[PDB]
Design a protein around this ligand. Sequence first.
Ligand code: SJ0
Length: 305
Amino acid sequence: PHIGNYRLLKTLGKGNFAVVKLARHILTGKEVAIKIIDKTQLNSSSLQKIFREVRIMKVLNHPNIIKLFEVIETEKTLYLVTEYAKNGEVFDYLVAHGRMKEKEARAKFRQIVSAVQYCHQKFIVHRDLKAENLLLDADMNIKIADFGFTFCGSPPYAAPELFQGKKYDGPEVDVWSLGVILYTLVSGSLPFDGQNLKELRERVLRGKYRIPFYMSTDCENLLKKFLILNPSKRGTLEQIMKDRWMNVGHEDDELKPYVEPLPDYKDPRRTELMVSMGYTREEIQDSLVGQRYNEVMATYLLLGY
Ligand SMILES: CN1CC[C@@H](COc2cnc(C#N)cc2-c2ccn3nc(NC(=O)C4CC4)cc3c2)C1
């Protein structure tokens, strides 16, 4: 049960393409998730998508997005070592506990909106936002996952453009799915449903949904800023951040675009511990400035917890 500096612990998910395992980084003692991809079993276009996802993961550094720590490549197998979100998916938490009170849904939703807006700053569109892709860490903080690697709960989140044959590429697609996510957080149910796809599509294209009796007028006013049939009439996430419901109980701390902190490759506390482990100062610096995502860089990132 061993890959690089990691002790393979248990299986968190399985497939024909990839196996996600829980693991312990031996040097630091931290638990991580490791996606193990047999590249020989991939189709013609699947490896291009996996490589695109790796590229996106390397650039995203947000407290509410699953952080990548290491990439290990061999001819046949690709290993992606990422952050482990102990409390599973928001989807399962909603099934287990029911709807969140607006105060609890607000805490989660401010983190989700911050994360998706931060992706949009770097021209990254998720296109598959759903409760299944929103994970929860040990402190119940949101951790967004899946930027390329299928539709078990995907159709209820699809923007009307999918069913109209129109383009499905802009950030406005994510703005629609975020309205569906807000709806499930506060109701435990989906705004657009059906028995088959024909029934789902009719409801999505009509754009009408039930307002549950307990929903506040402030919450419904916010939902109407996301669930707009015309993609060109949907507001940006930067504009939506200024909404009243978003900031109830955050009168000081208004939600605004995330400002990524500047890189710190010379932390003396971590550099000293790494030198004691056997790494050299030059090994540490070259790995960090080159953004290598190798075992040295991974140890520096893992030591930041
Ligand atoms: C459809 N859903 C399945 C899971 C999620 C996709 O998960 C990932 C995808 N890509 C990478 C990479 N590289 C990494 C993860 C990941 C990152 C962190 N975690 N914490 C967990 N935690 C648990 O399973 C807890 C025991 C319950 C699982 C996971 C999985 C979306």
